[PDB]
């Protein structure tokens, strides 16, 4: 009710109004970065192999 005790509205971004809960959600997704990189890199390998691009040299040897 005191107007000066709600300054967290503009001091803190809305995405983190939830304190630790909102920080935890961001942190959890952060932990998935490298697993995503390995997964994405695998897809590139899958396409690269299926197109016979690894046999570029063996084809003509």
């Amino acid at each position: 009710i005191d107007p000066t005790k709600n300054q967290w509205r503009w001091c803190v971004d809305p995405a983190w109004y939830g304190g630790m809960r909102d920080k935890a959600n961001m942190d959890m997704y952060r932990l998935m970065v490298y697993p995503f990189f390995g997964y994405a890199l695998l897809y590139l390998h899958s396409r690269f192999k299926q197109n016979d691009k690894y046999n570029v040299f063996a084809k003509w040897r």
Binding site: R21, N25, M28
Partner: peptide, 28 residues
């Protein structure tokens, strides 16, 4: 209380790993 609700300095140590999992689940 915003004073305790915020000030997340070293909150992970206060909540532990299971608390981190709980907070993530409760954020959704």
């Amino acid at each position: 209380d915003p004073d305790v609700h915020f000030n997340l300095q070293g909150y992970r140590e206060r909540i532990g790993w299971y608390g981190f999992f709980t907070a993530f689940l409760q954020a959704n």
